[PDB]
UniProtKB/Swiss-Prot annotation, chains A, B:
Subcellular location: Cell membrane; Apical cell membrane; Cell surface
Protein name (record): Cell adhesion molecule CEACAM6
Subunit structure: Homodimer; homodimerizes via its Ig-like V-type domain. Heterodimer with CEACAM8; heterodimerizes via its Ig-like V-type domain.
Tissue localization of expression: Expressed in neutrophils. Expressed in columnar epithelial and goblet cells of the colon. Expressed in numerous tumor cell lines (at protein level).
Effect of L20A: No effect on homodimerization. Reduces heterodimerization with CEACAM8
Glycan-linked positions: N71, N78, N82
Gene name, Swiss-Prot/TrEMBL: CEACAM6
Domain Ig-like V-type: 2-108
Function: Cell surface glycoprotein that plays a role in cell adhesion and tumor progression. Intercellular adhesion occurs in a calcium- and fibronectin-independent manner. Mediates homophilic and heterophilic cell adhesion with other carcinoembryonic antigen-related cell adhesion molecules, such as CEACAM5 and CEACAM8. Heterophilic interaction with CEACAM8 occurs in activated neutrophils. Plays a role in neutrophil adhesion to cytokine-activated endothelial cells. Plays a role in cell migration and cell adhesion to endothelial cells.
Notes concerning its domains: The extracellular N-terminus Ig-like V-type domain is necessary for homophilic and heterophilic intercellular adhesion.
Effect of I5A: Loss of homodimerization and heterodimerization with CEACAM8
Entry's family note: Belongs to the immunoglobulin superfamily. CEA family.
PTM annotation: Glycosylated.
Length: 108, 108
């Protein structure tokens, strides 16, 4: 089934939090990478996560506000007006036939 | 030492071959995913490759002419006009702070 991302809530007050959820995770997943923007881009990588070891490693775009959970959910806290826009998840699979999906939220 | 892709040769005769090589591979690499086009996109995945097991899995853009190697290079033989343009490699790393790079060749 097709990986999709949903922000809850979509519309977020500045200084509050958003949770980005993934639906239809693939069965053979081994880990995750979250990105700022609409495209998988290593300079825009917020955090990587290995399921088996439960290790999160910040990427270049990490800002001290993002936490990734084992089901791929991403919490971003202390959102600012500059955060409005798109976010992209990759689910890394054991055969490296990886999947990705993009979602968005809005800060007011 | 940013990851980069180069085609050898850059100008490729139809029916001959091209090698896409990668410079500055990360040390903690665990595998590779090659794509047709300018981004990581599952609909354009040529092949995924796990270094440890040497298992290659084709994606939708696989054409039977591409081979992937432990040094991350992609060899395309019997090049056709459909093959021109951009290709993107993602190097999957053990921390999933993955890196990608894009290159191109021209067929004549
Ligand atoms: Zn699925
Ligand atoms: Zn980039
Ligand atoms: Zn406000
Ligand atoms: Zn607005
Ligand atoms: Zn305002
Ligand atoms: Zn070179
Ligand atoms: Zn490097």
């Amino acid at each position: 089934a097709k990986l999709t991302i949903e922000s809850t809530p979509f519309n977020v007050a500045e200084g509050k939090e958003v949770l980005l959820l993934a639906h239809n995770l693939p069965q053979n997943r081994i880990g995750y990478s979250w990105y700022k923007g609409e495209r998988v881009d290593g300079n825009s990588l917020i955090v990587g996560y290995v399921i088996g070891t439960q290790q999160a490693t910040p990427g270049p775009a990490y800002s001290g506000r993002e936490t990734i959970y084992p089901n791929a959910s991403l919490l971003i806290q202390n959102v600012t007006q500059n955060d409005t826009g798109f976010y992209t998840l990759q689910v890394i699979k054991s055969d490296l036939v990886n999947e990705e999906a993009t979602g968005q939220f809005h800060v007011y």
